[PDB]
Amino acid sequence: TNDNYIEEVTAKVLTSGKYSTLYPPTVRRVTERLFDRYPPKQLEKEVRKKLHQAYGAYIDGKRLEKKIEKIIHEIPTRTEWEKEICLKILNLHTSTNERTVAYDELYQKIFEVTGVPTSITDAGCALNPFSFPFFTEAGMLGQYIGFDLDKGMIEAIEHSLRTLNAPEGIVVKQGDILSDPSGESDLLLMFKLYTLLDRQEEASGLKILQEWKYKNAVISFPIKVGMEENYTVKFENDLVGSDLRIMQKLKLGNEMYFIVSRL
């Protein structure tokens, strides 16, 4: 039938070890999206290209977990000690590395505009869940739900959090903000993810910020003459037509943080 090519192609690429460590609904999404365009044939070659174009850079947690096992073994007021371990963990990836020397006041700065929330949602969280000594101290004692695309990374975060005896409110899982049903949060975090979304699906960043329900959302961008496209102003120009309001524009470290609210 019509719905059988999708389930067959989705399973045919999810079976291949090249594309098995990613969220199946994403493959289910790009196959259903590329179905009307291209003919029934070439679909696998068209989805494996789209996956390579968009999600090809996030396909293992083995090396990461052993990297984190070293950090928690190399160490002998204790609240400050647990930070210096999370900070060394937050330095493994370039994503959360530059945010160091800013995690000390990042959640304080954000909560000055939004208030201490009851729950934080982190889309494409990556290593950001390990910033829990900073937002729990900032007042956020609710449930933290961070999700990402690569399975192996989420497994590495899950096991490392239990080894740290982190609060059981710090939940990690796998998910895609473009294919999972619309969520609801007291504070949605899109740290260095908005521009990534517009590559995977055209004009999807503003769509997610409009479809998702949140009291407040924080969308961040890097800062880094004139040989790289400036995408911060691109986002500032994207919000002219929407009913989304910029409540505050925080510049911390090498990053710009936009606190967006729809009321």
Ligand X SMILES: Nc1ncnc2c1ncn2[C@@H]1O[C@H](CSCC[C@H](N)C(=O)O)[C@@H](O)[C@H]1O
Give the burial class of 143: count Cβ atoms within 10 A of its Cβ; 0-12 exposed, 13-18 middle, 19 or more buried: middle
Which one of 121, 176, 235, 258 is in contact with ligand X (CB under 6 A)?
176
Residue closer to ligand X, measured from CB, 5 or 207: 207
CA–CA separation, 149 vs 81, rounded Å? 30
Do 198 and 205 meet the contact criterion of CB atoms below 8 Å apart?
A: yes
**Three-state DSSP state, 234:** helix
Residue closer to ligand X, measured from CB, 9 or 126: 126
Q: Taking CB under 6 A as the rule, which mask of x and - marks residues 221-250 in contact with ligand X? A: ------------------------------
CA–CA separation, 93 vs 126, rounded Å? 9
Residue closer to ligand X, measured from CB, 96 or 114: 96
Q: Find the residue with minimal CB distance to ligand X.
A: 124
The two structure tokens encoding residue 213? 């329900």
CA–CA separation, 39 vs 157, rounded Å? 40
The distance of closest approach from Cβ of residue 190 to ligand X in the complex, given in angstroms and rounded to an integer, is 7
Residue closer to ligand X, measured from CB, 5 or 183: 183
Regarding 196 and contact with ligand X (CB under 6 A), the answer is yes
Q: How many CA atoms, within 13 angstroms, populate the side-chain half-sphere of residue 223?
A: 11
58 is in an annotated binding site: yes
Which segments within the chain are labelled E, that is strand? 119-123, 143-148, 170-174, 184-185, 187-191, 213-214, 217-222, 245-252, 255-261
Which segments within 38-130 are labelled E, that is strand? 119-123
The two structure tokens encoding residue 131? 């910033």
95 is in an annotated binding site: yes
Which one of 10, 21, 31, 96 is in contact with ligand X (CB under 6 A)?
96
The two structure tokens encoding residue 126? 């990556």
The distance of closest approach from Cβ of residue 212 to ligand X in the complex, given in angstroms and rounded to an integer, is 12
Regarding 58 and contact with ligand X (CB under 6 A), the answer is yes
136 is in an annotated binding site: no
Regarding 64 and contact with ligand X (CB under 6 A), the answer is no
Closest CA to 93 of 121, 119, 57: 57
CA–CA separation, 50 vs 94, rounded Å? 25
116-175: which residues touch ligand X (CB under 6 A)? 123-126, 128, 148-150
94 is in an annotated binding site: yes
Which one of 47, 154, 177, 209 is in contact with ligand X (CB under 6 A)?
177
Q: Using CB under 6 A as the criterion, which residues of the chain lie in contact with ligand X when the complex forms?
A: 58, 95-96, 123-126, 128, 148-150, 176-178, 191-193, 196, 200
Q: Binding site for S-adenosyl-L-methionine: residue ranges?
A: 58, 93-95, 99, 124, 148, 174-175, 191, 200
Q: Binding site: residue ranges?
A: 58, 93-95, 99, 124, 148, 174-175, 191, 200
